[PDB]
Every structure is written in structure tokens, then in C-alpha cells.
């Protein structure tokens, strides 16, 4: 299955030149799925559409009566349907049902199934189109299966592009290697998300009695982003083409912009070995954040005692706190708690206090009102999060704990954090607010009720914390993973933020106790202390070099040999050691019998 499926890439075309271009072409010598189809070996199976398809069928009478394309082709969303009426093509955008072998083949009155449109049965016909004789052009040629209908369907930028050609055939179930070019036919604007499709036989079993003929053959091959060189003639016709990916000779003659090459050595590309794995290494665990003070005091602060801090230069246990079964509730207003387990920040601000169970409703970042506004409410500008756990069992009392008082109203404290903490008769916006004289007032209820009170009363100790994001150094982080070490392979790696790609090796490179890594005379880095083992590793780059093709004249032979410059053949391909033949399409554009020289492999 090869040299089929080239199409004129667009409408701008021009005379007598070699044009090299990138598109979703069918790559040469890819394996096409031949649906050899015969009576009991029979059906119209749904097939994924991927990036687009080359499609072909052995034909004459339009036995492949059409196609359906879409996401589902049966339910909810719109679908494109394309049908050969006996004269012409029909196109619709409607959301057809198609539960079975597709036979909703009802049609308009003027030449039904023959001229005017078919499959009228659905509910969203935002586009409809009538062609002229585009089923008679198939029916023109002599006898069924003695011809190949040949198409490309590609979908991009909301357009379905349709290209076709039509050619003779000698074998009724084969796909011959003869080069031909498809002409454009449509650039349909329908905007449909196509991801699946099927061919339509519409319950047909042709009077072309080759087998009783519940039978045909049709062919599907997936398009791929590839570089083709296309050869135009003086009539603006594509006459030949080269898939530049196929083998080292195809790559050579694309690079040289020619169909013929003289005896010589030519430089074409760079070899560059890809990494096999990834190595991340970090020190012995240390510098744990001081959360035990804020979170794990035996008796928490009252609303007015409100213990508060900001913290830095430490590793956050927040993954454990998030994983903890304890807390009655916790919420993040900022980024998700699930990522605060491992994320990094410049610092945190953190504080803790208590509520009667009901008032936990008002305490959060993103939440404001006369409860929290007058004893603790933070600014909502940090990555703020809030947590609650049982005071009801611990620092409560059955009367309501009269030391754990209610919030202290002071309406005029509008500023965040300040949000009057204080134990004072101060409730108004601006009245004199001494101790208890008739000018001013204090709410002074008890918050800390014991666990036998109703589930509204049942009080919570509470923590708020607030992570700070800046371009400045992220002095707090969650804990970080260290991998196994991987000597003697090209890998990605990371020390303490010294990232690269290279081959890590054991080394004799003696250096002082205070030194972490060696530069070299170029001042690129070449050796590192492993932060966990204190191993002294040496780093070298993954192998790379020019690729050169050695050739006789293509006039004389299409055999080639390939030189990988400067590298050791040990690093070069998982090869198959035949002379002459490069298994190149799969294997490294190359792939065969090996010899070493000082110029390279």
C-alpha cells in the first residue's frame, strides 16, 4: 500500500518546480487496512477518524453509497452525512439516529434517491447541498470492482476537505502501487467535531453478481504530519513525490532539492540521543515548619487571645494535616488543599482561636460579617485556608466556658487582620467607648459548650493559615521526593535545582568538603555531589553529531550507507546487521551492519 494518496495541497499552484511542504499526508509504505468483505464476512463497522483518512474502494455502481462522519453519528450532536443518489452527491449536517445498518434512506420528491436529497429524517439540518452528476462519474467506467474510487478526507479549521481520483483496477480485492494525484472537490464549512465515521452500503447487495455480492473491498489509511517534496510539471500537474521521512536516501534527496544525486558524501541532519529516564535527588529531610505551636496547643487561644505568626525557611507537613482524620471541617479559599501538600511559597501567615460550633459559618477567607469582622478576620489576598477541630471534648465547659467568650463587636474596625480582637466595650462606629458607661457596649456571651450540648453549640478550635506567592525565593515548600540514581545512561536529572540532561557517571574527581559541584574550564558544570549519598558524580552530555549519507550516483544505484559522525557505535541503533539494507522507516532512519572509524560510526 504505497504512492497512493497525494493531493494538491491547496489552490495556489504553479509550474515546473520542486516544492517541499508539510501536511497531513499518507506516509509512503504505511499499512492500509483492507476490509476484504464477503457475505458472512460482512457489516459496516464504525471506524475512528483520527487526524483524517485516505479512503478507497473497488467500485463502479456506487456500491459504497456514502459516508457518515461525526463524534457519535447517532445521538445528540450534529453529524455530516454524504450520500450518492444515483445521479449525484447529497450532503447534510443533521443529527441522524442510525441505530442499525443505516436505512433511514427517505428522500425529497423531485427524482427521489436519484436527484433530490436523501436521509431527511433528523432534527438540525443547518447545512444541505445538492451536487450535479457526482455518482454518474463513478458509473461511467466499465464494470464494478474493475475501478478504484480513491479519496482523502481531512478535517481542520472547521472545514472538511474532500479530495478524489478515480482509476482502473485488475484485481477486485487489491490496492495497486500505481502513483496518482487526487483533485480537491469540497472545502465544506460545517464545523463538526469528527472523531468517528462509517461507510454506507444502505442495505445493498449488488446485482453485479461476483459472489451474490453482500460484498466488496474498501481500504482505510491514516494521514500523518509529514514533509513531502512534490514535483510539478509545465502544466502545473504533480508528477512525482518524495516522503522525506521514509529512509536515508529520501531524506538526502529532499535535503538536496533534487530527484537525482551524484556519487559523494552529504551532510543531512543531526543525531541526538533521547533520555531513557529521570533522576531527582534532594538532601536529608530537615527544617520542618513550626505548625505544632499554631495547630497543637493543648488548650487553644480564645477569640481575643488569638495566637498569630508568620513562618519561613521550612518544609511544610501540610500533606499529613490534609491526610488527618481529625478536623471537623477544613476549606481553602486559595489554591486547592490537595496541592498545598506539595506547593511552594515565599512565606505563610498563620493563627488559631475558638468558636461556638454555629459561628464557624463566618470565619473563612472569602467570608465577612459582624462575627468575624470583630475578632480575627484576615485579608482575602493570601492563599488562605481554614481548619476546625473539637473544642467540645477538651477546652469547653458544660456551662459554656466563660473564659472562651464570644466575639467582641466593634463596628468601626474596617481593616483586615485588625478586625477588632480586643476585650473592650467598643461596639459602635465612633462613640466614646470607655469601660461600661451608657455611651458604649460589649457582647460577652460564652462560646465553649461541652459535647453533650446540641450539635449547633458543639464548639471548634480553629486554625487559619495563609500562604504568600511572590517572584522572590520560595522559603516554604511541602516535602520533595528523591528517586533512585541511574548511572551510565542518558537521563534527565535534578540536584538541588541544578537541572539538566546528561550521562551521570561515578568519578575520581576529588573536591573539598564545602564544595557542591565542579565547573570546568568552559565554566559549564561537569560534576556534582549527590545530596543524599555524598557520592561524587561526573556529568557528560548525551551523544550527538552530524549524520552523513554516502552514496554512489542514484543513476547507478539506490543503495546508501550512513555515517554517524564522532559517536561510538555502542550508542548507535538497536540495529539488524545486514549489509546494503537500512530498516530505516522504523529504525533511526538507518538500522543495519556496523563498522567503527575515527570519523564516527
Amino acid at each position: 500500500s504505497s504512492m497512493r494518496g497525494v493531493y494538491y495541497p491547496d489552490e495556489i499552484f504553479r509550474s515546473d518546480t520542486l516544492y517541499l511542504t508539510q501536511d497531513l499526508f499518507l506516509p509512503f509504505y504505511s499499512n492500509v487496512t483492507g476490509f476484504h468483505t464477503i457475505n458472512h464476512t460482512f457489516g459496516n463497522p464504525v471506524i475512528p477518524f483520527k487526524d483524517g483518512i485516505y479512503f478507497a474502494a473497488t467500485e463502479k455502481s456506487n456500491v459504497v453509497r456514502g459516508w457518515v462522519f461525526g463524534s457519535t453519528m447517532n445521538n445528540k450532536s450534529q453529524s455530516v452525512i454524504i450520500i450518492n443518489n444515483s445521479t449525484n452527491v447529497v450532503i447534510r449536517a443533521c443529527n441522524f439516529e442510525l441505530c442499525d445498518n443505516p436505512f433511514f434512506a427517505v428522500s425529497k420528491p423531485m427524482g427521489t434517491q436519484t436527484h433530490t436529497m436523501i436521509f431527511d429524517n433528523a432534527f438540525n439540518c443547518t447545512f444541505e447541498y445538492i451536487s450535479d452528476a457526482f455518482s454518474l462519474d463513478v458509473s461511467e467506467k466499465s464494470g464494478n470492482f474493475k475501478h478504484l474510487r480513491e479519496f482523502v478526507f481531512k478535517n481542520k479549521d472547521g472545514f472538511l476537505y474532500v479530495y478524489k481520483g478515480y482509476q482502473p483496477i485488475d484485481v477486485v480485492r487489491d490496492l495497486p502501487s500505481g502513483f496518482n494525484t487526487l483533485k480537491p472537490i469540497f472545502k465544506l464549512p460545517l464545523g463538526i467535531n469528527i472523531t468517528n465515521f462509517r461507510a454506507i452500503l444502505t442495505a445493498f447487495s449488488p446485482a453485479q453478481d461476483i459472489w451474490g455480492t453482500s460484498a466488496a473491498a474498501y481500504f482505510v489509511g491514516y494521514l500523518k504530519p509529514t514533509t513531502f517534496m512534490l514535483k510539478y510539471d509545465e502544466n502545473g500537474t504533480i508528477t512525482d513525490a518524495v516522503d522525506c521521512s521514509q529512509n536515508p536516501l529520501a531524506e538526502l534527496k529532499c535535503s538536496v532539492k533534487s530527484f537525482e544525486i551524484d556519487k559523494g558524501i552529504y551532510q543531512t541532519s543531526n543525531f541526538r540521543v533521547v533520555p531513557s529516564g529521570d533522576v531527582v535527588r534532594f538532601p536529608n529531610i530537615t527544617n520542618l515548619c513550626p505548625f505544632g505551636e499554631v495547630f497543637n496547643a493543648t488548650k487553644f487561644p480564645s477569640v481575643y487571645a488569638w495566637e498569630r505568626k508568620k513562618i519561613s525557611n521550612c518544609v511544610a507537613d501540610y500533606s499529613v494535616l490534609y491526610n488527618s482524620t481529625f478536623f471537623s471541617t477544613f476549606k481553602c479559599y486559595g489554591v486547592s488543599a490537595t496541592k498545598l501538600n506539595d506547593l511552594c511559597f515565599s512565606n505563610v501567615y498563620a493563627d488559631s482561636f475558638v468558636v461556638k460550633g454555629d459561628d464557624v459559618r463566618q470565619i473563612a477567607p472569602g467570608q465577612t460579617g459582624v462575627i468575624a469582622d470583630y475578632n480575627y478576620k484576615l485579608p482575602d489576598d493570601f492563599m488562605g485556608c481554614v481548619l476546625a477541630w473539637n473544642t467540645r471534648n477538651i477546652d469547653a465547659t458544660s456551662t459554656g466556658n466563660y473564659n472562651y467568650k464570644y466575639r467582641y463587636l466593634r463596628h468601626g474596625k474596617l481593616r483586615p487582620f485588625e478586625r477588632d480582637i480586643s476585650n473592650v466595650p467598643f461596639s459602635p462606629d465612633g462613640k466614646p467607648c470607655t469601660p461600661p458607661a451608657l455611651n458604649c457596649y460589649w457582647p460577652l456571651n460564652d462560646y465553649g459548650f461541652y459535647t453533650t450540648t446540641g450539635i449547633g453549640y458543639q464548639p471548634y478550635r480553629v486554625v487559619v493559615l495563609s500562604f504568600e506567592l511572590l517572584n522572590a525565593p520560595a522559603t516554604v515548600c511541602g516535602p520533595k521526593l528523591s528517586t533512585d540514581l541511574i548511572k551510565n545512561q542518558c537521563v534527565n536529572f535534578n540536584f538541588n535545582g541544578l537541572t539538566g540532561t546528561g550521562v551521570l557517571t561515578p568519578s575520581s574527581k576529588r573536591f573539598q568538603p564545602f564544595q557542591q559541584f565542579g565547573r570546568d574550564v568552559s565554566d559549564f558544570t561537569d560534576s556534582v555531589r549527590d545530596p543524599k549519598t555524598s557520592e561524587i558524580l561526573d556529568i557528560s552530555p548525551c551523544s550527538f553529531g552530524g549524520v552523513s549519507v554516502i552514496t554512489p550516483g542514484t543513476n547507478a544505484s539506490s543503495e546508501v550507507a550512513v555515517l554517524y559522525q564522532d559517536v561510538n557505535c555502542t550508542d548507535v541503533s538497536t540495529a539488524i546487521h545486514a549489509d546494503q539494507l537500512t530498516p530505516a522507516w522504523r529504525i533511526y532512519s538507518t538500522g543495519n551492519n556496523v563498522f567503527q572509524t575515527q570519523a564516527g560510526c
Partner: antibody
Amino acid sequence: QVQLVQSGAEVKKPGASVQVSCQASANTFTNHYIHWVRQAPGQGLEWMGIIYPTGGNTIYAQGFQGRVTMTRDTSLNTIYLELSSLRSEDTAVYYCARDVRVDDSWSGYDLLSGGTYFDYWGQGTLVTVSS
Amino acid sequence: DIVMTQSPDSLAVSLGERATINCRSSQSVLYSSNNENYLAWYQQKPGQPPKLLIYWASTRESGIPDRFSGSGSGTDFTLTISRLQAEDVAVYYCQQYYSLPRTFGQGTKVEIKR
């Protein structure tokens, strides 16, 4: 809201253990706290017990703290009963309330607002004192 | 408690008559940060977990009987309970959308003048 289902209607013998079964999903057992069905099936199954099946965090009235004690039946993402001191309180309807709709674009066990009264109801089940 | 409780335990309307679901709750239900008030009518059969079917207690929400919900009033409520041998007979009470402890109680059962 949740993948809501309830079952496991049983007679709870005076002073013995009590058990039940449910199914749940998403916000109703993880953002909002689910409710343990904790009133007799002659009425609505009032949320005298409060639970998070996706974390083991719980709150209760002090009869229901034992008589409708609950555990995470992880295969259903939902509560299964594991109660003690069975009686007329343990005779509550065999149900788990998929909690009220999420109060914010929150994260974690965030139900400092929004109720344990159901956004989704598992249809529940019977129960009684086994005397 | 904030498991909000019905007052009647069963309803008392005549055929098509406009009886009420009387109810009571905990404290600060019309809360200063949220303002829409947290009491909502439960409207569903006995043995179920109590499901919220009249958000903010002014009228029935989607899937409620419409004749079975109405005016909330902070610590107290009085929903419509029309023809409550049927329709509003789907067992009902005020219930909290309040926080962790929020619920409906036993709910008023179906009943009518006879």
C-alpha cells in the same frame, strides 16, 4: 449529587450492636458532610449524627454518638453502621444523607457552611427495637 | 438545636384548605454574612434522609409539592400545607442548609380534617 442508595433495615436488640448499608459519591460525602439517618422511620431520618465517609471525620448528639455510630464502607464510597447500645434511637431509618450542594469553589472537608440535610437521598430503609 | 424541628408532628388541612407546616430552629438563621437565611423546607416521605426542597424558605423549590412550603422567619417558620391528606402530605419541616450540624427533624406527617 452522590451515587445515593440506602439499605440494611434491621431490628436492634436492647443494649446490642447496630448495623446498616449505603452508597455515595462526590461533594455529598467529601465537601459537605453526609448525615447519619438518626430518627425513627415513622418520620424523616433527622441528622443527629454527621459524617465524612471520604475521611472518617464525624460529629454527633451523645445518644447517636453510640446508637448510630458509623464507619466508611469504602467499596460504596459511603457509610455503613457500626453502632452500640441499641434501642429506640438505634431504630432510626437505615439511611445516609448525601449532603447539601457545595457552598463554594472550596476544597477538602469544607462544610463550615451548607447542611447535612440531603441534596441527594438514598430512599432509606426501616428499623425498630428488637425487644 | 440546628436540626430544625416541626411543631405539628402531623398536618390538619381540609380538602383543598390552606393549613400550615409550623416549625422552629436554633439561632441566627438569618445570618449577617449570607442574608438569604439558612432554613429551607424538607418535603419528602418518612424513612428517607430529610432532603432540602424549598431553599431560603419563601416558596417551594423544584420537586416540592408547591402547596407544602412558604414563609420562614429566623428561629421560626410557617410554610403552606394545603390539602395535607395529599400533596403537602409528603412529610415536611423546616431544615438547615446552615453548616456541618444542619438538618430537618422528624417532619410533619400527612394528615387532614375528617
